[PDB]
Chain length 295, copies 2
């Protein structure tokens, strides 16, 4: 089972570079607008309204490849800037902006000075951070999902946290998690394992012909949680159970029977065995990802 | 420093613009459209003796579609295990490209496609046993693997089939299989696989570059003594050529390769004691020396 990303071509044709002062980062160019982190206009104590009113259109240099786009308008929306440009992007895909929930997955097109370098698939952690791979220059890189040619943009990268994970906003500029765009002492909160995803991934393992970790027990939802919550697992709800419906129907293993398998895995370990080649329980595939990569 | 690595694929857009659907009878799969040629598995003509099966086929036998666009086939020939279909339209999205034959251990990105439509991209390595551990569903035959170097796409893999263990086999872009496999159903099986020692060393170097260095020690080993241990843990033998490939990582860190081998030998014998190296609890073997630089830039 491979952690697959969505093909990045539709997003690559939207990436541009935005410079203000000596500060450069990425922006997303859709139609006649460029979106980028507002910190492109910047310390420990920024007042963005006060920093922005001091700028004009010609304060911003926007480049698509080696070609300048003229800024003819700007506004700030939460933690993003929206720059109106004189050129409309002919390669703008059909798109939406979406704010995803913790536990959901997405592809990141990692970019440096407006040029795409790599693509990877990740999950938003329950604490709203992402375990990515961002180097100096990657702010403004975006995450997305693709559904029948429509790009749903869900993430724009803003900052690195002390524990070496990442934080960002949705494409309305609102941070995921309790984070702010300045250099404060701010830290990643407590995190949990994404239970729903682990169960999805155990279903993937059954669908791909592996059954070793099954057992003869069932469990109630309550009794499952009492165990799994001891292992730093997210509480599982009836809604999460319901979501596992298609996978359960497809394999013939009732969701609560799979929970009983998981309980035994947590309590007894894997004991030198692997699942889908992994020595550890994987939590970055949603039920939707499994259906995409299985069916 | 980086706390961990992701397996990162190349941006796929240059390759997406080259994917088409090829249909011949009831068989449909993916092709690669570069200039006025479409390259696809020769087994598109099948539901043995391809030479003969292909005499029974004409240009009109082949339906080629690039999204909604019909590309009329105006010539066909077989090259090893590929069909080359000349079409009426040179692909306007052809990137700068090369065809290269990948070596065992090396990595590349795969753009998984379904009936001509790109569905996902992931990074994989050519295993020592000449198979890849991929994700290819119904309709993914013809998907391609590649690397990109300064906007030149080097194609190295085309997917042909899945083996009984669930691993995958394919050819280079001249149609010559990787490993002993054939494009026909036989009892063919993947040979036992080994861990890619070169890449494991590379990723130990990446760990050090990123400040994770608890596993280092003040001792060295000979190549032979390391190989006795490695081989006992089902690792590939390290050759002098491999030692030279690690030269740039070794120079940067001032850690001699055989000194890193000494670190690795202790890790294999003693395990990791529950610690992580670059955020992994296992020794990773799908990042090459080149991949390490790329992720560290």
């Amino acid at each position: 089972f491979r952690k697959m990303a969505f093909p990045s071509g539709k997003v690559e044709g939207c990436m541009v570079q935005v410079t203000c002062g000596t500060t450069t980062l990425n922006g997303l160019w859709l139609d006649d607008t460029v979106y980028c982190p507002r910190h492109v206009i910047c310390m420990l104590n920024p007042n963005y309204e006060d920093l922005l009113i001091r700028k004009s259109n010609h304060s911003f240099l926007v480049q698509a490849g080696n070609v300048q786009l003229r800024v003819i308008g700007h506004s700030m929306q939460n933690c993003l800037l929206r720059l109106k440009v004189d050129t409309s992007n002919p390669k703008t895909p059909k798109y939406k902006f979406v704010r995803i929930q913790p536990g959901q997955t997405f592809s990141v097109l990692a970019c440096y000075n407006g040029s795409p370098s790599g693509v990877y698939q990740c999950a938003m952690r329950p604490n709203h951070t992402i375990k990515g791979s961002f180097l100096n220059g990657s702010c403004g890189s975006v995450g997305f999902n693709i559904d029948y040619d429509c790009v749903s943009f869900c993430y724009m990268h803003h900052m690195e946290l002390p524990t070496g994970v990442h934080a960002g906003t949705d494409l309305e500029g609102k941070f995921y998690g309790p984070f702010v765009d300045r250099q404060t002492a701010q830290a990643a909160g407590t995190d949990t394992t994404i239970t729903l995803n682990v169960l999805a991934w155990l279903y993937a393992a059954v669908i791909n012909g592996d059954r070793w970790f099954l057992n003869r027990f069932t469990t109630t939802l309550n009794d499952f949680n009492l165990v799994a919550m001891k292992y730093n697992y997210e509480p599982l709800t009836q809604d999460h159970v319901d979501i596992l419906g298609p996978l359960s129907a497809q394999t013939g293993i009732a969701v609560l029977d799979m929970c009983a398998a998981l309980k035994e895995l947590l309590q007894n370990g894997m004991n030198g065995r692997t699942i889908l080649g992994s020595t550890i329980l994987e939590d970055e595939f949603t039920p939707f990802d499994v259906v995409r990569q299985c069916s």
